[PDB]
Tab-separated table of C-alpha atoms in Angstrom:
chain	number	residue	atom	x	y	z
A	1	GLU	CA	96.692	113.567	66.392
A	2	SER	CA	97.203	113.927	70.154
A	3	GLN	CA	93.568	114.303	71.418
A	4	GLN	CA	92.493	111.136	69.583
A	5	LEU	CA	95.435	109.208	71.212
A	6	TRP	CA	94.481	110.600	74.637
A	7	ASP	CA	90.819	109.571	74.086
A	8	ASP	CA	91.942	106.053	72.985
A	9	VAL	CA	94.186	105.596	76.051
A	10	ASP	CA	91.485	106.962	78.427
A	11	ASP	CA	88.837	104.678	76.892
A	12	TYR	CA	91.266	101.724	77.385
A	13	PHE	CA	91.894	102.639	81.060
A	14	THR	CA	88.183	103.335	81.678
A	15	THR	CA	86.863	100.063	80.183
A	16	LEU	CA	89.582	98.007	81.966
A	17	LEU	CA	89.860	99.638	85.401
A	18	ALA	CA	87.150	102.269	85.992
A	19	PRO	CA	84.116	101.566	83.829
A	20	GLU	CA	81.266	104.070	82.953
A	21	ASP	CA	78.813	101.709	84.814
A	22	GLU	CA	74.925	101.861	84.678
A	23	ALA	CA	74.514	104.503	87.519
A	24	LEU	CA	77.120	106.743	85.849
A	25	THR	CA	75.704	106.313	82.302
A	26	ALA	CA	72.184	107.036	83.613
A	27	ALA	CA	73.476	110.166	85.405
A	28	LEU	CA	74.868	111.495	82.098
A	29	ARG	CA	71.606	110.653	80.205
A	30	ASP	CA	69.609	112.558	82.873
A	31	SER	CA	72.005	115.591	82.867
A	32	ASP	CA	71.869	115.802	79.022
A	33	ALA	CA	68.052	115.613	78.941
A	34	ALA	CA	67.799	118.388	81.579
A	35	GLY	CA	69.928	120.720	79.335
A	36	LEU	CA	73.166	120.690	81.351
A	37	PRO	CA	76.204	121.513	79.157
A	38	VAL	CA	83.991	113.192	81.464
A	39	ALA	CA	86.926	110.931	82.563
A	40	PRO	CA	85.703	107.944	84.628
A	41	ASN	CA	89.294	106.847	85.277
A	42	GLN	CA	90.023	110.305	86.907
A	43	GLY	CA	86.744	110.030	88.818
A	44	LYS	CA	87.984	106.684	90.166
A	45	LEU	CA	91.306	108.389	91.107
A	46	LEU	CA	89.230	110.833	93.216
A	47	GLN	CA	87.282	107.927	94.785
A	48	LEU	CA	90.573	106.182	95.640
A	49	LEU	CA	92.097	109.398	97.100
A	50	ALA	CA	89.093	109.683	99.481
A	51	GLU	CA	89.321	105.964	100.356
A	52	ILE	CA	93.081	106.172	101.061
A	53	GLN	CA	92.451	109.254	103.261
A	54	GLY	CA	89.794	107.282	105.169
A	55	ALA	CA	87.222	109.991	104.511
A	56	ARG	CA	83.883	109.864	106.341
A	57	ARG	CA	82.771	113.455	105.536
A	58	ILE	CA	83.242	115.123	102.121
A	59	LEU	CA	82.399	118.610	100.904
A	60	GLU	CA	82.191	119.257	97.118
A	61	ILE	CA	82.302	122.884	95.886
A	62	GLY	CA	81.039	122.846	92.245
A	63	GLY	CA	74.817	116.823	87.863
A	64	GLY	CA	76.212	114.582	90.617
A	65	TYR	CA	78.944	112.840	88.422
A	66	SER	CA	82.247	113.648	90.397
A	67	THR	CA	79.776	113.551	93.339
A	68	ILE	CA	79.012	109.821	92.597
A	69	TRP	CA	82.760	108.956	92.575
A	70	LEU	CA	83.304	110.788	95.910
A	71	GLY	CA	80.174	109.285	97.442
A	72	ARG	CA	81.312	105.743	96.492
A	73	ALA	CA	84.344	106.199	98.806
A	74	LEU	CA	82.214	106.765	101.920
A	75	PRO	CA	80.962	104.406	104.600
A	76	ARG	CA	77.204	104.086	105.417
A	77	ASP	CA	77.466	106.608	108.361
A	78	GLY	CA	79.345	108.955	105.946
A	79	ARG	CA	78.206	112.429	104.763
A	80	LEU	CA	78.738	114.080	101.342
A	81	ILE	CA	77.567	117.698	101.017
A	82	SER	CA	77.496	119.247	97.519
A	83	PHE	CA	75.982	122.400	95.953
A	84	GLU	CA	73.638	122.959	93.008
A	85	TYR	CA	72.631	126.397	91.761
A	86	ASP	CA	68.813	125.946	91.753
A	87	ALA	CA	66.047	123.378	92.417
A	88	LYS	CA	66.202	121.822	88.916
A	89	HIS	CA	69.978	121.221	89.077
A	90	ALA	CA	69.504	119.871	92.633
A	91	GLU	CA	66.766	117.478	91.434
A	92	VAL	CA	68.984	116.088	88.647
A	93	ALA	CA	71.828	115.523	91.145
A	94	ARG	CA	69.609	114.031	93.865
A	95	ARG	CA	68.003	111.494	91.534
A	96	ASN	CA	71.428	110.575	90.094
A	97	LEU	CA	72.983	110.213	93.556
A	98	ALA	CA	69.984	108.102	94.797
A	99	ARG	CA	70.289	105.812	91.766
A	100	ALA	CA	74.027	105.387	92.641
A	101	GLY	CA	72.894	104.148	96.140
A	102	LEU	CA	74.073	107.348	97.885
A	103	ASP	CA	70.919	109.250	98.971
A	104	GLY	CA	71.391	108.359	102.710
A	105	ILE	CA	74.954	109.894	102.627
A	106	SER	CA	74.354	112.679	100.003
A	107	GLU	CA	72.920	116.133	100.917
A	108	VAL	CA	72.657	118.622	97.993
A	109	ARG	CA	72.386	122.257	99.134
A	110	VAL	CA	70.554	124.644	96.766
A	111	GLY	CA	72.024	128.032	95.737
A	112	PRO	CA	75.195	129.696	94.428
A	113	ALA	CA	78.291	128.231	96.236
A	114	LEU	CA	79.298	131.815	97.251
A	115	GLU	CA	75.978	132.159	99.194
A	116	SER	CA	75.693	128.538	100.384
A	117	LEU	CA	79.221	128.255	101.820
A	118	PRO	CA	78.997	131.027	104.474
A	119	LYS	CA	75.493	129.669	105.412
A	120	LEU	CA	76.962	126.182	105.842
A	121	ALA	CA	80.013	127.466	107.803
A	122	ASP	CA	77.702	129.584	110.033
A	123	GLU	CA	75.738	126.407	110.932
A	124	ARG	CA	79.039	125.179	112.520
A	125	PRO	CA	79.028	121.691	111.002
A	126	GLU	CA	81.450	118.925	111.931
A	127	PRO	CA	84.702	119.308	109.949
A	128	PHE	CA	85.191	117.562	106.598
A	129	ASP	CA	87.853	114.992	105.780
A	130	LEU	CA	88.095	115.896	102.066
A	131	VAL	CA	87.042	119.035	100.188
A	132	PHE	CA	86.877	118.783	96.382
A	133	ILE	CA	86.868	122.151	94.557
A	134	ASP	CA	85.750	122.155	90.860
A	135	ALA	CA	83.903	125.460	90.632
A	136	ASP	CA	84.467	128.917	89.084
A	137	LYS	CA	88.247	129.439	89.205
A	138	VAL	CA	87.769	133.188	89.770
A	139	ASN	CA	86.901	132.406	93.446
A	140	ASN	CA	89.255	129.376	93.893
A	141	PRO	CA	91.244	131.106	96.689
A	142	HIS	CA	88.044	131.919	98.571
A	143	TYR	CA	86.953	128.254	98.210
A	144	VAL	CA	90.313	127.091	99.639
A	145	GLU	CA	89.807	129.556	102.585
A	146	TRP	CA	86.350	128.018	103.243
A	147	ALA	CA	88.010	124.547	102.954
A	148	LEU	CA	90.559	125.572	105.639
A	149	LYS	CA	87.714	126.846	107.920
A	150	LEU	CA	85.777	123.528	107.418
A	151	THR	CA	88.582	120.893	107.737
A	152	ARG	CA	90.831	119.544	110.511
A	153	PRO	CA	94.428	118.382	110.654
A	154	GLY	CA	94.934	115.469	108.214
A	155	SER	CA	92.113	116.529	105.908
A	156	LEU	CA	92.748	116.674	102.138
A	157	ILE	CA	91.825	119.482	99.716
A	158	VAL	CA	91.654	118.584	95.999
A	159	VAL	CA	91.440	121.349	93.379
A	160	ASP	CA	90.474	120.288	89.853
A	161	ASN	CA	91.375	122.045	86.596
A	162	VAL	CA	94.488	124.033	87.683
A	163	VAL	CA	96.393	123.958	84.356
A	164	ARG	CA	94.058	126.291	82.301
A	165	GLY	CA	95.401	124.803	79.014
A	166	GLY	CA	98.963	125.843	80.049
A	167	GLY	CA	97.764	129.388	80.832
A	168	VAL	CA	98.424	128.983	84.550
A	169	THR	CA	102.132	129.947	84.058
A	170	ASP	CA	101.233	133.488	82.810
A	171	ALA	CA	101.910	135.832	85.792
A	172	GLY	CA	100.677	138.704	83.575
A	173	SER	CA	97.304	137.104	82.653
A	174	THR	CA	94.245	139.366	83.091
A	175	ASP	CA	91.971	136.329	82.891
A	176	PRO	CA	90.063	136.003	86.209
A	177	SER	CA	90.188	132.164	86.041
A	178	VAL	CA	94.015	132.150	85.519
A	179	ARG	CA	94.502	134.701	88.341
A	180	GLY	CA	92.254	132.807	90.752
A	181	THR	CA	93.952	129.495	89.936
A	182	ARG	CA	97.452	130.976	90.420
A	183	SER	CA	96.350	132.632	93.719
A	184	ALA	CA	94.859	129.350	94.996
A	185	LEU	CA	98.087	127.443	94.179
A	186	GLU	CA	100.105	130.249	95.855
A	187	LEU	CA	97.841	129.992	98.932
A	188	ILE	CA	98.547	126.201	99.168
A	189	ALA	CA	102.291	126.879	98.859
A	190	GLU	CA	102.571	129.749	101.363
A	191	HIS	CA	100.003	128.616	103.987
A	192	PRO	CA	101.907	126.989	106.858
A	193	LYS	CA	99.087	124.417	107.384
A	194	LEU	CA	99.069	123.120	103.765
A	195	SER	CA	101.490	120.881	101.900
A	196	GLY	CA	100.567	120.268	98.272
A	197	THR	CA	101.481	119.544	94.679
A	198	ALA	CA	99.935	119.826	91.240
A	199	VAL	CA	100.277	117.547	88.213
A	200	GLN	CA	99.313	117.829	84.532
A	201	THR	CA	96.996	115.291	82.953
A	202	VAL	CA	95.682	114.482	79.510
A	203	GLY	CA	92.764	112.287	78.509
A	204	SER	CA	89.143	112.487	77.381
A	205	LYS	CA	88.775	115.932	79.132
A	206	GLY	CA	91.797	117.262	77.164
A	207	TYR	CA	94.914	118.841	78.671
A	208	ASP	CA	94.529	119.986	82.281
A	209	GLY	CA	95.586	118.874	85.770
A	210	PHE	CA	94.809	118.914	89.448
A	211	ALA	CA	96.255	120.042	92.799
A	212	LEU	CA	96.278	118.123	96.121
A	213	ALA	CA	96.899	119.749	99.498
A	214	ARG	CA	97.095	118.018	102.884
A	215	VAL	CA	96.160	119.923	106.048
A	216	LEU	CA	99.055	119.466	108.574
B	1	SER	CA	109.749	119.770	71.529
B	2	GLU	CA	107.404	122.844	71.429
B	3	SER	CA	104.652	120.762	73.268
B	4	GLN	CA	107.364	119.386	75.629
B	5	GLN	CA	108.453	123.004	76.293
B	6	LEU	CA	104.893	123.894	77.438
B	7	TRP	CA	104.806	120.783	79.679
B	8	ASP	CA	108.292	121.728	81.041
B	9	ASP	CA	107.132	125.321	81.741
B	10	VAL	CA	103.990	124.192	83.672
B	11	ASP	CA	105.954	121.570	85.684
B	12	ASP	CA	108.690	124.127	86.457
B	13	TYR	CA	105.946	126.494	87.769
B	14	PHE	CA	104.343	123.779	89.909
B	15	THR	CA	107.734	122.508	91.156
B	16	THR	CA	109.135	125.982	92.065
B	17	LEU	CA	105.886	126.929	93.877
B	18	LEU	CA	104.603	123.713	95.541
B	19	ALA	CA	107.296	120.988	95.385
B	20	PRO	CA	110.809	122.482	95.256
B	21	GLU	CA	113.877	120.190	95.261
B	22	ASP	CA	116.309	120.593	98.134
B	23	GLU	CA	120.095	119.990	97.892
B	24	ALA	CA	119.769	116.227	98.601
B	25	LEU	CA	117.359	115.787	95.628
B	26	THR	CA	119.446	117.886	93.171
B	27	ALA	CA	122.683	116.191	94.405
B	28	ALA	CA	121.036	112.790	93.799
B	29	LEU	CA	120.357	113.747	90.136
B	30	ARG	CA	123.951	115.052	89.718
B	31	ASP	CA	125.393	111.759	91.171
B	32	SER	CA	123.010	109.645	89.021
B	33	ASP	CA	124.013	111.515	85.814
B	34	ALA	CA	127.740	111.338	86.742
B	35	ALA	CA	127.360	107.504	87.287
B	36	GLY	CA	125.982	107.166	83.730
B	37	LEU	CA	122.332	106.379	84.784
B	38	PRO	CA	119.862	107.652	82.087
B	39	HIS	CA	119.275	111.439	82.470
B	40	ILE	CA	115.536	111.768	83.313
B	41	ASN	CA	114.078	115.344	83.263
B	42	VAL	CA	112.440	114.359	86.616
B	43	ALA	CA	109.160	115.978	87.824
B	44	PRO	CA	109.704	116.994	91.482
B	45	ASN	CA	105.967	117.730	91.581
B	46	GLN	CA	105.164	114.029	90.690
B	47	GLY	CA	107.682	112.946	93.352
B	48	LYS	CA	105.743	115.059	95.845
B	49	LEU	CA	102.494	113.416	94.659
B	50	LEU	CA	104.094	109.999	95.605
B	51	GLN	CA	105.148	111.432	99.008
B	52	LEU	CA	101.653	112.834	99.666
B	53	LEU	CA	99.949	109.561	98.585
B	54	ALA	CA	102.110	107.757	101.208
B	55	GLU	CA	101.365	110.383	103.900
B	56	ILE	CA	97.604	110.412	103.106
B	57	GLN	CA	97.574	106.575	103.360
B	58	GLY	CA	99.457	106.725	106.727
B	59	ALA	CA	102.329	104.637	105.384
B	60	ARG	CA	104.950	103.268	107.826
B	61	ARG	CA	106.466	100.576	105.554
B	62	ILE	CA	107.252	101.146	101.850
B	63	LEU	CA	108.565	98.728	99.247
B	64	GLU	CA	110.040	100.136	96.028
B	65	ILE	CA	110.839	98.040	92.929
B	66	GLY	CA	113.431	99.792	90.751
B	67	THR	CA	115.595	102.145	92.872
B	68	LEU	CA	117.802	103.571	90.032
B	69	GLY	CA	119.668	106.450	91.792
B	70	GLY	CA	117.169	106.750	94.670
B	71	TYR	CA	115.362	109.904	93.489
B	72	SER	CA	111.804	108.505	93.928
B	73	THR	CA	113.169	106.695	97.019
B	74	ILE	CA	113.981	110.060	98.709
B	75	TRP	CA	110.452	111.387	98.007
B	76	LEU	CA	108.948	108.153	99.394
B	77	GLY	CA	111.250	107.992	102.407
B	78	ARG	CA	110.338	111.611	103.392
B	79	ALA	CA	106.733	110.423	103.892
B	80	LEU	CA	107.801	108.036	106.689
B	81	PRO	CA	107.861	108.519	110.445
B	82	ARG	CA	111.208	108.212	112.248
B	83	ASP	CA	110.547	104.480	112.911
B	84	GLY	CA	109.265	103.878	109.355
B	85	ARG	CA	111.010	101.449	106.977
B	86	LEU	CA	111.677	101.653	103.225
B	87	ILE	CA	113.071	98.674	101.294
B	88	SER	CA	114.075	99.324	97.669
B	89	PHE	CA	115.196	96.828	95.004
B	90	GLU	CA	117.881	97.626	92.458
B	91	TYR	CA	119.246	95.047	89.993
B	92	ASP	CA	122.589	96.795	89.388
B	93	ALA	CA	125.084	96.814	92.267
B	94	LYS	CA	126.657	100.119	90.949
B	95	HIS	CA	123.194	101.821	90.779
B	96	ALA	CA	122.503	100.447	94.294
B	97	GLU	CA	125.649	102.141	95.626
B	98	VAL	CA	124.591	105.455	93.950
B	99	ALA	CA	121.120	105.135	95.559
B	100	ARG	CA	122.543	104.361	99.017
B	101	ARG	CA	124.899	107.409	98.863
B	102	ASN	CA	121.898	109.547	97.724
B	103	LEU	CA	119.720	108.219	100.562
B	104	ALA	CA	122.511	108.795	103.154
B	105	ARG	CA	122.900	112.399	101.948
B	106	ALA	CA	119.105	112.849	102.456
B	107	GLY	CA	119.477	111.429	106.054
B	108	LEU	CA	117.345	108.389	105.138
B	109	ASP	CA	120.040	105.690	105.616
B	110	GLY	CA	118.672	104.848	109.136
B	111	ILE	CA	115.211	103.851	107.772
B	112	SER	CA	116.053	102.580	104.258
B	113	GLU	CA	117.621	99.469	102.778
B	114	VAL	CA	118.622	99.024	99.134
B	115	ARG	CA	118.781	95.329	98.190
B	116	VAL	CA	120.800	94.221	95.142
B	117	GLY	CA	119.672	91.765	92.516
B	118	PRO	CA	117.001	91.118	89.952
B	119	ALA	CA	113.584	91.893	91.486
B	120	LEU	CA	112.230	88.447	90.404
B	121	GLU	CA	114.808	86.995	92.854
B	122	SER	CA	114.822	89.742	95.527
B	123	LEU	CA	111.013	89.612	95.961
B	124	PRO	CA	110.931	85.884	96.916
B	125	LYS	CA	114.073	86.374	99.082
B	126	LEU	CA	112.180	89.087	101.063
B	127	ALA	CA	109.093	86.833	101.133
B	128	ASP	CA	111.286	84.018	102.625
B	129	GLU	CA	111.735	86.345	105.691
B	130	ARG	CA	107.924	86.573	106.289
B	131	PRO	CA	108.075	90.365	106.684
B	132	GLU	CA	105.494	92.628	108.262
B	133	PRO	CA	103.316	93.773	105.321
B	134	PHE	CA	104.059	96.972	103.382
B	135	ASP	CA	101.658	99.944	103.272
B	136	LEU	CA	102.752	101.189	99.803
B	137	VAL	CA	104.510	99.298	97.014
B	138	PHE	CA	105.874	101.511	94.179
B	139	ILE	CA	106.670	99.510	91.035
B	140	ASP	CA	108.922	101.329	88.466
B	141	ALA	CA	111.254	98.676	86.978
B	142	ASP	CA	111.085	96.365	83.900
B	143	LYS	CA	107.522	96.088	82.589
B	144	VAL	CA	107.989	92.540	81.147
B	145	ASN	CA	107.938	91.406	84.791
B	146	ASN	CA	105.433	93.942	86.234
B	147	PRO	CA	102.650	91.258	86.398
B	148	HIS	CA	104.910	89.140	88.631
B	149	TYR	CA	105.802	92.253	90.682
B	150	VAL	CA	102.053	92.899	91.291
B	151	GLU	CA	101.645	89.198	92.240
B	152	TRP	CA	104.412	89.591	94.832
B	153	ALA	CA	102.967	92.920	96.023
B	154	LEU	CA	99.700	91.033	96.818
B	155	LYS	CA	101.709	88.586	99.027
B	156	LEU	CA	103.543	91.532	100.795
B	157	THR	CA	100.581	93.907	101.565
B	158	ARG	CA	97.440	93.990	103.719
B	159	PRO	CA	94.000	95.487	103.306
B	160	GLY	CA	94.310	99.244	102.798
B	161	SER	CA	97.809	99.015	101.317
B	162	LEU	CA	98.396	101.002	98.064
B	163	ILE	CA	100.205	99.666	94.878
B	164	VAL	CA	101.479	102.351	92.500
B	165	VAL	CA	102.736	101.334	89.022
B	166	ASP	CA	104.672	104.017	87.135
B	167	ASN	CA	105.095	104.410	83.380
B	168	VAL	CA	101.968	102.498	82.182
B	169	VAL	CA	101.069	104.575	79.051
B	170	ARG	CA	103.962	103.325	76.826
B	171	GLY	CA	103.700	106.280	74.467
B	172	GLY	CA	100.005	105.324	73.919
B	173	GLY	CA	101.137	101.816	72.810
B	174	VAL	CA	99.395	100.243	75.865
B	175	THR	CA	96.043	100.065	73.943
B	176	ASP	CA	97.539	97.789	71.207
B	177	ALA	CA	96.481	94.157	71.902
B	178	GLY	CA	98.704	93.208	68.922
B	179	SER	CA	101.836	95.056	70.078
B	180	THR	CA	105.180	93.298	69.408
B	181	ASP	CA	106.755	95.366	72.247
B	182	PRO	CA	107.188	92.926	75.158
B	183	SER	CA	107.167	95.923	77.582
B	184	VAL	CA	103.655	96.816	76.290
B	185	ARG	CA	102.547	93.188	76.765
B	186	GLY	CA	103.823	93.169	80.353
B	187	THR	CA	102.219	96.550	81.142
B	188	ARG	CA	98.833	95.324	79.787
B	189	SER	CA	99.068	92.048	81.792
B	190	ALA	CA	99.853	94.029	84.973
B	191	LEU	CA	96.894	96.442	84.440
B	192	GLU	CA	94.608	93.470	83.675
B	193	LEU	CA	95.684	91.797	86.946
B	194	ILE	CA	94.848	95.036	88.902
B	195	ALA	CA	91.481	95.306	87.134
B	196	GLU	CA	90.517	91.604	87.521
B	197	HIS	CA	91.952	90.671	90.948
B	198	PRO	CA	89.120	90.767	93.498
B	199	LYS	CA	91.453	92.165	96.222
B	200	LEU	CA	92.466	95.215	94.095
B	201	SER	CA	90.540	98.419	93.218
B	202	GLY	CA	92.507	100.522	90.740
B	203	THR	CA	92.665	103.150	88.048
B	204	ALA	CA	95.234	104.577	85.667
B	205	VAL	CA	95.616	108.161	84.376
B	206	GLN	CA	97.768	109.844	81.720
B	207	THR	CA	100.200	112.572	82.699
B	208	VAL	CA	102.373	115.064	80.837
B	209	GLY	CA	105.218	117.166	82.207
B	210	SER	CA	108.983	117.343	82.280
B	211	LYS	CA	109.264	113.514	81.932
B	212	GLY	CA	107.118	113.624	78.756
B	213	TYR	CA	103.815	111.850	78.007
B	214	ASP	CA	103.301	108.937	80.396
B	215	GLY	CA	100.992	107.863	83.205
B	216	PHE	CA	100.547	105.752	86.320
B	217	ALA	CA	98.253	103.180	87.892
B	218	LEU	CA	97.061	103.220	91.525
B	219	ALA	CA	95.445	100.247	93.301
B	220	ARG	CA	94.077	99.864	96.787
B	221	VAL	CA	94.100	96.422	98.502
B	222	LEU	CA	90.655	95.269	99.668
B	223	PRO	CA	89.735	92.572	102.211
């Protein structure tokens, strides 16, 4: 059946091109033990997108596993800011990012993203080169608005999980995650400062897809 | 067909919203079909992903292996600045003329060149000229020879250049080390060269959509 084929192909790509290496396997062992609820080859796609963009500063909205792939793209004077909900989640991420050789570039902020983002914006930080959004889809548009406030021309915004199992095409959906995904894609389309696309994927995470948007 | 219909519906949504086709792109498909090139239920939204990858990279010089009717070529060429250059290889002189007409309609004839002949001969002919390196090489031709196309891409790029290899999933056949399909063997050899070459950092991902179940590889050139 189809999921087994997708797993087999993703395992083949992962072991050849983008292996689940010792820092990444340890991160998963630590997350499991801590009671937290992957596609290394898509993680490596994210790493390569940041590297091609020439990113020095990355913001992640929505432990530490996509965060390790993003962090791996950065130079030594780089900065990666990410969010964890509470101290325990932050500790798991920080230890996993340190083990991945990223603790001098990684800063994990503690709290709900909806509280931590206005605090961060109100500090008036230097703009980010890439914002990766993989959070609650209900607030995806809001997260893209914060991304616009916190980027500069030429920055990249990446939105994960925009297919909703095919549900994203339902204009009549009541589901808050479908509505927030559709509104975020519509914001990318209509905003004069954003040019984007979205693509469907399959693999070890099942059927989904991602959106990319470049700030003009 | 029912799973293809879902993939078609989601790609139509993404295309209509984020990546719509203008007249030059739809004309290019009409001309390609009328010339007897295989009808491909193209994904404008994957074409835009190629365009954005080039723009993100800062590409000025693009090399394409496998023009067909110039559909991907138009997406790639639209990433370039006015003094950019796109060179595309097509084996078939009739397909090459279709691609050049399609590129001229898109207003890309001033920055693009479509070279005729088998890519195993056109690559060394371009190499003979000692060209300025290319920023992005898009390989979407015959997979038997994709390892040799990656070898030539290494000789025609510089650090920070991007190599993109289309159609690397092979229906899921790419995992079969015992495949009798020579196009699977060539795909595997080309992915192994990306993985093993110390100047390349790459990945590959599986896609679905209006083209069906497939996938692509991306590799960055390192120092």
